[PDB]
Symmetry: D2
Subunit: 292 residues, 4 copies
């Protein structure tokens, strides 16, 4: 049946709240909806072998839950401090009857990126969906406040980590495989307070489009997803200022931010074998901002 | 299982072939694949009520087949000369166990656009997916060859028809409904020989994004699909020069054009109730050109 | 010397004000600055032969003044009710020592478009800069309020008029000539209240890019300019709602709208013979919105 | 007078030619035209104080020549091996009657970036035009060939160097100053063989747009220039495969690549004080490809 999207999920104002990054979904108010109850699989990805970075919380968690419910085995990356979020996702993947692999570690470390891919492929018996979804986002009002360490941390997480993981993954990927990279509306919106983050998110789009041309001839599709505002720990752990969290997305056409559950369908559609002429695309889901 | 997209469908060279517009799918060599055998529904749109313009052939036919197999009732628009293509789609909708409504007529006629919507809604018992997919595309190498009649025919079909149909449809659309407009990579690629067509396809994107902001607050989502090259009668009936048809998409990353079957998943995903934060988006499927 | 752009021109709030379209610059509060005092020519367009539609006021007036001061002869189009604005521009072109031609008439009339070009070329002794700058902009909050007459008036002014004038002009344009089309940030921003206008402005970009590919081989360059908010009669005569006029561009990085004087340099640079590899471009001047 | 842009400059085929990067303009066949004879200044930047990275050759050299001829003092960065190109630019700046400052060194070195800005500002008596134009571009057909050292060299040159130089420069820039960043059509075209380069060029655009929003309120404008193909040593020293150099831009609307002379007007126009509402823009000059 039909459902009105406007009031399907919570609207601001939200309680004043902050966490140290990367944060925990379980400490947000309200708790985000990653599709734990609502997502019903229909056999769209049976037997696929998936690695999702940042699969413990937020958009990556929603994708991991959906992939498992569609019949795919799922390895998740995350940072060690997020173990309490990650254990929930691992249990949900397993409750869908599929294999879950927990692979915590810092993707700014090149050797860890190599081990992440090797261990995921070994555990799953192969690899044929890669989702580069982990990110650092730390807002700063001025470039004068941005140290080299700040800029480097954002670029190493969001560009180098993706590069190393993707490079390590390609020798495993058979014809028919899919790579999906999470970008952001910030690639275009380029807010004053997200100078380094926006740089990396625009970079991710060109990386996606170039790699799609490179790998298309080998039968591997490479695509990106461009979210607008979603209710995740990235925002309340310093990705946005606190007043922005309280009134998050209040001025958007629905008057509310997205919940991660709502974007999982884009990841399933892009990975599915039937979506065979989608390559090099950036698919947006921004609730009416109309960016991608 | 995994399937290599590169050789899943035919590659050029194709036989020298030309038709008068709008053409018939059954006269193309090879016959296009709209998903007649391959598309399997999974209950994703049960009971939805759909109107697809240009649903007799090509991308619109692939969308109509998929919608019916996902459980939706489907009305199709087309031009009277296309009856032999259209009756096949009516039969496919009925073979999926759903109601089919055949509504031929010329969408450059404002009164016909009003009757099309009124008759579709009356026959289906409502309306909650509208796909503005019909188009005119007639390549010309120079503006000196483009008469006012040429320009007006393209603009009246691709902009005015969409405007009139959409305006008439909105009073029928409940919260939870979806409007999907087919645009083109030509909105950006803007080839020398498609001056009027490219103008209209860029126009369709801004129309989509503006209307998404108007209707989002009312719970209606408005999105666009941007195909790259697909094997359809629009291309061999004057949309492309004949030598381009012979070698169509030969230089693309897969070395082949898309078949309409491959893009149907985008229409299903955009219409599904679960894709509830996709509004004002343009989703491409261009086989690695990397436009949208 | 250096000048701070932030406070170079007036900032809101502006007096409550409205006019019947197309409006008069002389009735705005404050009066707009089209460069009447500030623009100093430097011989950049000596002997060029120009036609500017909407050259009586706003951006077109600023371009006409600059072209004349750079040594070009200038014909201007405008609507008859704007005679009092137009006579000022004609006097300023002539005070720069160049020829001015006043060509009032409605560009929605195909025969007038043909006469406009023929009379401009006859009077000037040729034609080698064409600026399609006239536009209709009438905001409406809902498609339900938008009659066919409303939509048609916007599309006929902004797309058909450009088509007819451009088609009539090309046989006059020698190698080295330039066509410049004014678009808008609305092509991308696509506000809810500018459904028809935004459609046409996106269309203008694809028209520009396609015609550039068509005419590049003949040595004719075709480019577009994408303004952000400028203080012109288009806004207070129904292009924007009244509260928007009072607080116009207050939230932008400078906190003020542009004055037409500020965008004239883009038109001069695009027309100049030295800018010989700019073809098919869209150059923005939006005061930090960062759209084009 | 009018000049036909099509045959104003050389067209392919060009001789088979390759150099080690960064290469020398003097070894290209034919020698590039940076405007040494053609560019005539008109007092548009009198007394400005400029730093151009990569000012020894190519687009940066054309900008440096034009800036000096418009009345600005010019410091140039370059790599020590390019001294024979750089000394010619120093001589051209001095022949225009302005001060030239030669500042060779490697912008991947953060301490050098700080010294570069400090020494330029000290020598010139201030700083008010900064052009981040240096780049690394090394084509590779596959990500398997791209070592971390390759990726890091491109990212450190094109993103970190820009970040460090810009951060060091801002405390010197008074209201009225301009920052201009050279990007590329590759930000959008994203070719298969330019995976790291295209990533950085898209990043540069978002960096530009974000910084424009930060600095606009302080009266500093930040813009980008997006060249299409130009005849420069970056291309024949590994930026393109050798067979592409031989046939460079043969299929474009003019059938020839740009010469650096042709793009200098964009840098002058963006820096000029009169262009006061251009902020956060990307202005293309791609010869009819129609990208930006
Ligand atoms: N939430 C939004 O509004 C929004 C908007 C646009 C784009 N995005 C994108 O969505 C993606 C997912 O973020 P999210 O919003 O779901 O938030 P999230 O905090 O739930 O997910 C980000 C994840 O990144 C991972 N991560 C961060 N640094 C890492 C490191 N050094 N090593 C390993 N893993 C690391 C963490 O595991 C974390 O869970 C990101 O790419 C982000 O850019 C989010
Ligand atoms: N095939 C491609 O390469 C391609 C590429 C990009 C975009 N598109 C878009 O795909 C959409 C569908 O076209 P297609 O390629 O499937 O070709 P198609 O010929 O199968 O479909 C176009 C349909 O338009 C309908 N139509 C045309 N003029 C009409 C009129 N006056 N009144 C009513 N109906 C009318 C016809 O019924 C026709 O079947 C179009 O919007 C087109 O712009 C196609
Ligand atoms: N002012 C802004 O904020 C803004 C922003 C983006 C784009 N633009 C564009 O700038 C261009 C110029 O408008 P402006 O803002 O300088 O306002 P303006 O009112 O000064 O100029 C518009 C002109 O259009 C002409 N015109 C309108 N309908 C016509 C018709 N039927 N026949 C002949 N001429 C007709 C009138 O002569 C009028 O002076 C337009 O193309 C507009 O889309 C303006
Ligand atoms: N030529 C083209 O076709 C083309 C196309 C699009 C964009 N671009 C852009 O144009 C800009 C200028 O390049 P060009 O084509 O004029 O070629 P070029 O080789 O003449 O200039 C590039 C310059 O970069 C400098 N450079 C490189 N690495 C450096 C380092 N580590 N430290 C200091 N300086 C360093 C060198 O001094 C060199 O002269 C670049 O940003 C490039 O991305 C060029
Ligand atoms: Mg987390
Ligand atoms: Mg048909
Ligand atoms: Mg006027
Ligand atoms: Mg050099």
């Amino acid at each position: 049946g039909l459902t009105n999207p406007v009031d399907l999920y919570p609207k601001p104002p939200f309680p004043h709240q902050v966490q140290a990054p990367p944060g925990l979904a379980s400490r947000m108010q309200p708790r985000p909806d990653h599709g734990e109850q609502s997502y019903r699989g229909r056999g769209r990805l049976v037997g696929r072998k998936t690695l999702v970075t940042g699969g413990d919380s937020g958009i990556g968690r929603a994708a991991a839950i959906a992939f498992a419910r569609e019949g795919a085995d799922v390895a998740i990356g995350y940072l060690p401090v997020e173990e309490s979020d990650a254990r929930e996702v691992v249990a949900l993947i397993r409750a869908a009857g599929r294999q879950a692999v927990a692979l915590p570690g810092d993707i700014r470390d090149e050797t860890f990126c190599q081990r992440l891919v090797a261990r995921a492929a070994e555990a799953l018996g192969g690899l044929d969906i890669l989702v580069n979804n982990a990110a650092r986002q730390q807002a700063l009002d001025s470039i004068g406040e941005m140290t080299t360490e700040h800029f480097d941390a954002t670029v190493k997480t969001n560009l180098y980590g993706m590069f190393w993981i993707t490079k390590a993954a390609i020798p495993h990927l058979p014809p028919g495989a899919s790579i999906i990279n999470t970008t952001s509306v910030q690639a275009v919106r380029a807010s004053a307070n997200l100078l380094d983050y926006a740089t990396t998110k625009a970079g991710i789009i060109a990386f996606t489009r170039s790699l799609a041309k490179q790998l298309g001839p080998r039968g591997i599709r490479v695509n990106a997803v461009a979210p607008g505002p979603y209710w995740t720990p990235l925002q309340s752990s310093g990705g946005q200022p606190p007043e922005t969290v309280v009134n998050y997305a209040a001025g958007s056409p629905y008057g509310r931010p997205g919940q991660p559950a709502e974007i999982a369908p884009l990841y399933v559609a892009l990975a599915a074998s039937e979506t065979s002429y989608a390559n090099g695309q950036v698919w947006g889901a921004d609730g009416g901002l109309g960016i991608f």
